[PDB]
Amino acid sequence: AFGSVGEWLRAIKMGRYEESFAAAGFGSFELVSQISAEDLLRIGVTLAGHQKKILASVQHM
Ligand SMILES: [Cl-]
């Protein structure tokens, strides 16, 4: 378990997206667990490799 979405993003080397997750309203794991590729694109994860890494990480929840 992570203490916050930030801690999670940081842990999976995706800390660069912290502010953009938070501003888009993804501040709980309940929301992030339902995240899709379209969501990731909307908030600014433009790289498919980062999208894949993020989505593979959430598929654990
Ligand atoms: Cl934090």
From Swiss-Prot:
The domain of life for this entry's organism is: Eukaryota
- In which tissues has expression of this protein been reported? Abundantly expressed in placenta but also detected in kidney, liver, lung, pancreas, skeletal muscle and heart. Expressed in primitive and myeloid, but not lymphoid, hematopoietic cells. Also observed in cell lines derived from liver, breast, colon, lung, melanocyte and cervix.
Q: Where in the cell is it found?
A: Cell membrane
Stretches assigned to the SAM domain: 1-61
> Mind telling me how this protein is modified after translation?
Phosphorylated; autophosphorylation is stimulated by EFNB2.
* Phosphoserine modified-residue sites: S4, S36
Role according to the record:
Receptor tyrosine kinase which binds promiscuously transmembrane ephrin-B family ligands residing on adjacent cells, leading to contact-dependent bidirectional signaling into neighboring cells. The signaling pathway downstream of the receptor is referred to as forward signaling while the signaling pathway downstream of the ephrin ligand is referred to as reverse signaling.
Q: Give the family per the record.
A: Belongs to the protein kinase superfamily. Tyr protein kinase family. Ephrin receptor subfamily.
Quaternary structure annotation from Swiss-Prot or TrEMBL: Heterotetramer upon binding of the ligand. The heterotetramer is composed of an ephrin dimer and a receptor dimer. Oligomerization is probably required to induce biological responses. Interacts with RASA1; the interaction depends on EPHB4 tyrosine-phosphorylation.
What pathology is it implicated in? Answer: Lymphatic malformation 7: A form of primary lymphedema, a disease characterized by swelling of body parts due to developmental anomalies and functional defects of the lymphatic system. Patients with lymphedema may suffer from recurrent local infections. LMPHM7 is an autosomal dominant form with variable expressivity. Some individuals present with severe non-immune hydrops fetalis, which may cause perinatal demise or fully resolve after the neonatal period. Others present with no edema and have milder clinical features, such as atrial septal defect or varicose veins as adults. Capillary malformation-arteriovenous malformation 2: An autosomal dominant disorder characterized by multiple, round to oval or more irregularly shaped macules that are pinkish red in color and are randomly distributed across the body. These capillary malformations are associated with either arteriovenous malformation, arteriovenous fistula, or Parkes Weber syndrome.
Q: What is this protein called?
A: Ephrin type-B receptor 4
Organism, per UniProt? Homo sapiens
Q: What is the lineage of its organism?
A: Eukaryota, Metazoa, Chordata, Craniata, Vertebrata
**Part of the full-length chain shown:** 908 to 968 of 987
